[PDB]
Amino acid sequence: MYTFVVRDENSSVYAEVSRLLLATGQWKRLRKDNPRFNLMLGERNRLPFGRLGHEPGLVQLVNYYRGADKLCRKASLVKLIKTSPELSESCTWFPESYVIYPTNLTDEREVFLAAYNRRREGREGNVWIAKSGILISSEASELLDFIDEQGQVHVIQKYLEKPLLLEPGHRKFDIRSWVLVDHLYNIYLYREGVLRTSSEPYNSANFQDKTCHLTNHCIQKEYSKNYGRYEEGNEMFFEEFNQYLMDALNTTLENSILLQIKHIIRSCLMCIEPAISTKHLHYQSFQLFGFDFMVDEELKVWLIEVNGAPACAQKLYAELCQGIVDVAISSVFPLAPTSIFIKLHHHH
Amino acid sequence: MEVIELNKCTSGQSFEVILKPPSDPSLEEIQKKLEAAEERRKYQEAELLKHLAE
Amino acid sequence: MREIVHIQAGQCGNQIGAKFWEVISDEHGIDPTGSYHGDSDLQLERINVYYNEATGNKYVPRAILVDLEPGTMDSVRSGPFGQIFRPDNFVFGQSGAGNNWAKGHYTEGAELVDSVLDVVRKESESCDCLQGFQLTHSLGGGTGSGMGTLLISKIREEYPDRIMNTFSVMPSPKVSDTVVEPYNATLSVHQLVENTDETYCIDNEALYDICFRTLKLTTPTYGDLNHLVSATMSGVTTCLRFPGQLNADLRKLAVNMVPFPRLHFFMPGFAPLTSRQQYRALTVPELTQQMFDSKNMMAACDPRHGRYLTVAAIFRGRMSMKEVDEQMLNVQNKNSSYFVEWIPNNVKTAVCDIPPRGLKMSATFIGNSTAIQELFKRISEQFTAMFRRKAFLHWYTGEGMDEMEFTEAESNMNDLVSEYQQYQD
Amino acid sequence: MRECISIHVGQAGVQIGNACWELYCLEHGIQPDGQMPSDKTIGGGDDSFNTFFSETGAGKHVPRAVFVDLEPTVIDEVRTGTYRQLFHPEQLITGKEDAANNYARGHYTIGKEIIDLVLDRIRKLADQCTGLQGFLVFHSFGGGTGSGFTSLLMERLSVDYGKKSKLEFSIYPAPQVSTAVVEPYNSILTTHTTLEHSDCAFMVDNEAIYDICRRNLDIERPTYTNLNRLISQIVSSITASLRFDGALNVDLTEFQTNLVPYPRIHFPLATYAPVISAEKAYHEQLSVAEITNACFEPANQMVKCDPRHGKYMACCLLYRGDVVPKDVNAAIATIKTKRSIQFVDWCPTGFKVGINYQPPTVVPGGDLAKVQRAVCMLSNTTAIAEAWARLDHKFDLMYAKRAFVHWYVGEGMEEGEFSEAREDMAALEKDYEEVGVD
Numbered sequence A: 001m002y003t004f005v006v007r008d009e010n011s012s013v014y015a016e017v018s019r020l021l022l023a024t025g026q027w028k029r030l031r032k033d034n035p036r037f038n039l040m041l042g043e044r045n046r047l048p049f050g051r052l053g054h055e056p057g058l059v060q061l062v063n064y065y066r067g068a069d070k071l072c073r074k075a076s077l078v079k080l081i082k083t084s085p086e087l088s089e090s091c092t093w094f095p096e097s098y099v100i101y102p103t104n105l106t107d108e109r110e111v112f113l114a115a116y117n118r119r120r121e122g123r124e125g126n127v128w129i130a131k132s133g134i135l136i137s138s139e140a141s142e143l144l145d146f147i148d149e150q151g152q153v154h155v156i157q158k159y160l161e162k163p164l165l166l167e168p169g170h171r172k173f174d175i176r177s178w179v180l181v182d183h184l185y186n187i188y189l190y191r192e193g194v195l196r197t198s199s200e201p202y203n204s205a206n207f208q209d210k211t212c213h214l215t216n217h218c219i220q221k222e223y224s225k226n227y228g229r230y231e232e233g234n235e236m237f238f239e240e241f242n243q244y245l246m247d248a249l250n251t252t253l254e255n256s257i258l259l260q261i262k263h264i265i266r267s268c269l270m271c272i273e274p275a276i277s278t279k280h281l282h283y284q285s286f287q288l289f290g291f292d293f294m295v296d297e298e299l300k301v302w303l304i305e306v307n308g309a310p311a312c313a314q315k316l317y318a319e320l321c322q323g324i325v326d327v328a329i330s331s332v333f334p335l336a337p338t339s340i341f342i343k344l345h346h347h348h
Numbered sequence B: 001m002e003v004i005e006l007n008k009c010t011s012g013q014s015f016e017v018i019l020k021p022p023s024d025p026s027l028e029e030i031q032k033k034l035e036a037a038e039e040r041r042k043y044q045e046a047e048l049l050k051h052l053a054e
Numbered sequence C: 001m002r003e004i005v006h007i008q009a010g011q012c013g014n015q016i017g018a019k020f021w022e023v024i025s026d027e028h029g030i031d032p033t034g035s036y037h038g039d040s041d042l043q044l045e046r047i048n049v050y051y052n053e054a055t056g057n058k059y060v061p062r063a064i065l066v067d068l069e070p071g072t073m074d075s076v077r078s079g080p081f082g083q084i085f086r087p088d089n090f091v092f093g094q095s096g097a098g099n100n101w102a103k104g105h106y107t108e109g110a111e112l113v114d115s116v117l118d119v120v121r122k123e124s125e126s127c128d129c130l131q132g133f134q135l136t137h138s139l140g141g142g143t144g145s146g147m148g149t150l151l152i153s154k155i156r157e158e159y160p161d162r163i164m165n166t167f168s169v170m171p172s173p174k175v176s177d178t179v180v181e182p183y184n185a186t187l188s189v190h191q192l193v194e195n196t197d198e199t200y201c202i203d204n205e206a207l208y209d210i211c212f213r214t215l216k217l218t219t220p221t222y223g224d225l226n227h228l229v230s231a232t233m234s235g236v237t238t239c240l241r242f243p244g245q246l247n248a249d250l251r252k253l254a255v256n257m258v259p260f261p262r263l264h265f266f267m268p269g270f271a272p273l274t275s276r277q278q279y280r281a282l283t284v285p286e287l288t289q290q291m292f293d294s295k296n297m298m299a300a301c302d303p304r305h306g307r308y309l310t311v312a313a314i315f316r317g318r319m320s321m322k323e324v325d326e327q328m329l330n331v332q333n334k335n336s337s338y339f340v341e342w343i344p345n346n347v348k349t350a351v352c353d354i355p356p357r358g359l360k361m362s363a364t365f366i367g368n369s370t371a372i373q374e375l376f377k378r379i380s381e382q383f384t385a386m387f388r389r390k391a392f393l394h395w396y397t398g399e400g401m402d403e404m405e406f407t408e409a410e411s412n413m414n415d416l417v418s419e420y421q422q423y424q425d
Numbered sequence D: 001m002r003e004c005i006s007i008h009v010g011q012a013g014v015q016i017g018n019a020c021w022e023l024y025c026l027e028h029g030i031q032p033d034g035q036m037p038s039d040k041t042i043g044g045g046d047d048s049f050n051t052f053f054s055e056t057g058a059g060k061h062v063p064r065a066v067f068v069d070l071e072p073t074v075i076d077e078v079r080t081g082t083y084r085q086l087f088h089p090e091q092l093i094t095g096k097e098d099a100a101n102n103y104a105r106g107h108y109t110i111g112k113e114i115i116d117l118v119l120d121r122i123r124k125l126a127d128q129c130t131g132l133q134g135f136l137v138f139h140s141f142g143g144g145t146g147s148g149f150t151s152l153l154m155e156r157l158s159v160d161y162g163k164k165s166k167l168e169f170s171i172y173p174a175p176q177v178s179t180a181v182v183e184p185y186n187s188i189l190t191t192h193t194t195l196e197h198s199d200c201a202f203m204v205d206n207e208a209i210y211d212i213c214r215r216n217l218d219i220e221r222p223t224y225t226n227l228n229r230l231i232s233q234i235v236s237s238i239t240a241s242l243r244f245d246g247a248l249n250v251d252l253t254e255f256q257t258n259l260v261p262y263p264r265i266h267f268p269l270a271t272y273a274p275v276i277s278a279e280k281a282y283h284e285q286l287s288v289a290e291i292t293n294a295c296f297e298p299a300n301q302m303v304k305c306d307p308r309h310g311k312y313m314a315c316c317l318l319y320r321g322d323v324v325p326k327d328v329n330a331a332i333a334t335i336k337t338k339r340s341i342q343f344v345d346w347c348p349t350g351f352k353v354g355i356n357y358q359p360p361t362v363v364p365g366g367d368l369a370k371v372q373r374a375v376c377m378l379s380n381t382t383a384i385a386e387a388w389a390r391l392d393h394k395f396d397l398m399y400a401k402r403a404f405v406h407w408y409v410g411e412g413m414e415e416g417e418f419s420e421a422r423e424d425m426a427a428l429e430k431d432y433e434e435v436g437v438d
């Protein structure tokens, strides 16, 4: 009988995993403070990694990689890409970004203005986005003044002015990919992704109204008036999106987009593997990641950010959560297909 | 990757490699503490004997 | 040279105490005449803990036999190992106690207690470094219960910084001699709450059920019950009698088992308990599964009704100490709901190479469980069923006691129950 | 030449001390009778090994050591053991009854009545020293003597020997071999009262030594002898610079200068490699890069923790055997480009290296195999704070219910000393966090 604890009551994902584990009859849940556990579904912030792997006779496993925050933080990701030789500052799939600390607190203010003044002089598109509460503007004076009014670290990156627009609608969108990394640092990509689309026509002459520019599921469902028009919940899945790329663009999701996404996932996770791997550690880690991508009208994929505690599309909870139990939990704690994941081989 | 202060002798050598530059209670006070705890022990045993005498 | 002084009082106390010395004398190679005839140095390594060494290389137990009538001790003196006890250590009267706690504690017992303390003082003055005392007695009678607790009160006065340990037989209506046993047990329990550091609770009902259901003894006798007590007393004292480091000391045992001064009442357990299929080899998994099963427990309390504050396990014989740790960690990791989570690593395991007589290996269980409150609840209910009608009190008021003293003992034991209840949640 | 006095307190200290002096003797060619054929100066001399051994007219080399235990059974082994002839009776002190795993019993009740005797015996050793450096104190955290009496002895040493350095070798408690539930109490009580009196302390977590013995030495159920033979190899590596000719860590002061820039953070992590099974058919001898790289593996750290998620304040590499500086620097470069090594911004990113050409001495019949080269890395990492967190957590669990507190109050200790000691640890954990995390 395997034992586990639940220290994150808000995780819609592992709420289902906990439900599945108990459904097997071979997993028993303990109070969240019982140290005699095999598996920890740990909290988001300040997870006590230092107390894992010190229970005699218990192989302990946790659903978070210590140190993965370097990849799942706005400012952290920028610093990681610019400083890691594996990614280099010339990384071709990450928008030009800069770490900007508010003036009330290193900082890349002047470095940003240099690149900014260069674009302004060259007649090129000079629209940037600030985030950490987001502001889109073409004037550097507005972006910097917006961060100084706050009190947390922000990042300014180039705004993709030529995004791929779905038709009909002439609308923006992003792509969410779920990636599961097991204790052996195998990189599995869920075969099912979701396009979080904007139900509003993309308007390039007005960044004030951010309803057609931000594809967040909560924004379209709160400030958009065409929510759920073209697809239920502004969530087009790969089957539909693939058939679209064929009818309209005469290509496939695999060739035009999926190769770039698989390449980006590998590069990011392989980069930090020496820093977060639990191969020789007294405990074991695995984690689910939510990668967010952008597609421009040239069918080039850009990485937007990485989420360390992602949610899942309602339709895909059952399949994905079961996959988490098969490859991540039962792989270390077996029980008495056609895999739903795509293994991204690499050199450890 | 500099090597400084290399010292060598018959039974070994030692050196320093720099990769990157940077960016009580008195004797009296102890006796009091010890004698204070001894007094609290004596007091507790006196209450235990007082309890047994009753 | 950490000596322990043994005291056995009353009928039950002297009959169980006799069997105890019979068992461990064999385990240490001491024959009925006190001569050593063992074949292992481990037998003598810690022999001086329970035995004095006399001339001619004779080992004399450090035991004092006390009773208010001669009968039982005449049997011991004529028993198997009767000749091994120091003749001067027989302290007895002629009146008897008539199963009366007041007679043993206030009247008949008071007349004899000083002479018993003269022998105790004599044994202690010859100890290089006295650890403490261990008393065997029942709580349902008069001498072991009433005079036993009187002896403990007066020993704690003369040796206030030594450890007081007792094996206490709790009465049960299923194995009862008189109807006043709950009176005597309730009066003693209060004394034990105050003046002992460790008490092994032995319920005659559990001993009976084990003899009847598990051992398949049709008509159990006191002798059958005392066989279980012997084996248990040998198991819980192994840490003290042989080389080791886990426990191996009355005070160190107390520090690891008693998180609160009044909650020092232990449930002992033993394995195996086989009915005569007695030659079969017993594996480590089997030893562990049985040692934790309630049917192997001698307090007659269901552990699943409470929680273990601390646990001490002792495995005897040549076995895989690696395989012992695994099974132990398996029991804790398979029933962690029955262990308090505010005492980390509260389950300690000890190994001993010398197994009991006639067994390849065995396991003894010592638990400080909050379920023990069921035992005090039964006693309290039986006490109140009679005390509410003042039934049978004239036996006690005739010895100078007042009803108020009964009310106080009643409340004191109900407080003890309430104390266990708060730590169970 | 300046002398060093070793003090062994409690069972863990004494038994570990027995294994070290056994090793010291084999290393310096000293026999059980104290004779040393290679010492051509009979009855005296100021060689490096004289910092740990004095000499008599008859030519006996006597350790500068004191063994203290409140119970006589452990120290009786030393009196009749193989090296019974090394020590004279003045060096071995034993009481009649121990501290029962009770800090307050060792520090107050029993400590008060024996402290003056121990100091007198240490004073005798000091009077043979012409330039005493300080003391090396071996003890456990979890025992009542190792914890309680040690902190009392450290307080008095700071009084009787003000300007003398004091280093610790402390045994961190591990349940797989622990025999007491209250060891978290004792560990935290003894760290609080010793923190201001210890200039540098090397913590060894029994859990780590246990797992190394099972993993590398293939010992299914390690014993204290197995554990102590391995611990004395690490200890020997740390004290070798004081006993042999050299220029690094030549005196106890240099230990603080090189490993402890901040006073309270004086607990360097020890890492040792390689540990090869003697029963092995025959192992392939590892290179300088391979053993150096092993210093950054959690598997051979004296305390299991993740240095990848801390910041270094200092780093010493202590090599023994066939090693040349050219190979050390080459391996270090290779490790920098592969490992996550972050130094605090107010400290240089460097490595002090010491090399002793004599390879590790293995005890005949021991468990360790002879190797041609070995290394012990001493690094002051914030990552070792994981150990304080673990321990402070278990403390919080029991103290929230006052479980077992009556045993300490019963020995004259005030309950308020629990919270006072715990608050000090909370400030210690905060110090690490302020130095390591951004």
Ligand SMILES: Nc1nc2c(ncn2[C@@H]2O[C@H](COP(=O)(O)OP(=O)(O)OP(=O)(O)O)[C@@H](O)[C@H]2O)c(=O)[nH]1
Pocket (backbone or CB within 6 Å): D009, D010, D011, D012, D013, D015, D016, D069, D070, D098, D099, D100, D101, D102, D106, D140, D141, D142, D143, D144, D145, D146, D147, D171, D172, D173, D174, D177, D178, D179, D183, D206, D224, D227, D228, D231
């Ligand atoms: N590595 C190692 N640890 C030991 C040894 N002896 C005891 N320990 C550890 O020390 C802790 C217990 O403290 P001890 O040193 O035995 O107790 P003590 O200092 O003698 O104090 P008291 O016996 O209570 O008077 C436990 O965590 C043991 O695992 C040893 O020889 N080697």
Ligand SMILES: Nc1ncnc2c1ncn2[C@@H]1O[C@H](COP(=O)(O)OP(=O)(O)CP(=O)(O)O)[C@@H](O)[C@H]1O
Pocket (backbone or CB within 6 Å): A095, A129, A131, A157, A158, A159, A160, A161, A172, A173, A174, A213, A214, A215, A216, A292, A294, A304, A305, A307
């Ligand atoms: N450089 C850029 N160019 C174009 N659009 C961008 C962009 N950066 C962000 N966006 C827009 O913002 C949205 C993503 O915002 P972001 O992910 O930074 O906020 P967030 O992290 O709170 C949402 P989540 O974490 O749930 O994916 C996308 O829908 C995208 O359209």
Ligand SMILES: Nc1nc2c(ncn2[C@@H]2O[C@H](COP(=O)(O)OP(=O)(O)O)[C@@H](O)[C@H]2O)c(=O)[nH]1
Pocket (backbone or CB within 6 Å): C009, C010, C011, C012, C013, C015, C016, C097, C098, C099, C100, C138, C139, C140, C141, C142, C143, C144, C145, C169, C170, C171, C172, C175, C176, C177, C181, C204, C207, C222, C223, C225, C226, C229
């Ligand atoms: N287990 C066991 N219990 C006994 C024995 N003799 C008496 N008892 C129990 O002890 C109680 C009677 O006390 P007893 O020892 O006979 O009275 P005392 O001589 O005045 O101390 C009753 O509960 C009996 O069941 C015995 O040999 N073994």
Ligand SMILES: CCC(=O)Nc1ccc(S(N)(=O)=O)cc1
Pocket (backbone or CB within 6 Å): C097, C098, C099, C100, C101, C180, C395, C396
């Ligand atoms: C507590 C029980 C008790 O004292 N019983 C007892 C005592 C004396 C006598 S008599 N009548 O004097 O022989 C009869 C019974």
Ligand SMILES: [Ca+2]
Pocket (backbone or CB within 6 Å): C111
């Ligand atoms: Ca009379």
Ligand SMILES: [Ca+2]
Pocket (backbone or CB within 6 Å): D039, D040, D041, D042, D043, D044, D045, D046, D055
């Ligand atoms: Ca000399």
Ligand SMILES: [Ca+2]
Pocket (backbone or CB within 6 Å): B024, D158, D162, D196, D197
């Ligand atoms: Ca000082």
Ligand SMILES: [Mg+2]
Pocket (backbone or CB within 6 Å): A305, A307
């Ligand atoms: Mg986000």
Ligand SMILES: [Mg+2]
Pocket (backbone or CB within 6 Å): C011, C012, C141, C177
């Ligand atoms: Mg009777």
Ligand SMILES: [Mg+2]
Pocket (backbone or CB within 6 Å): D010, D011, D071, D098, D099, D143, D145
């Ligand atoms: Mg000891």
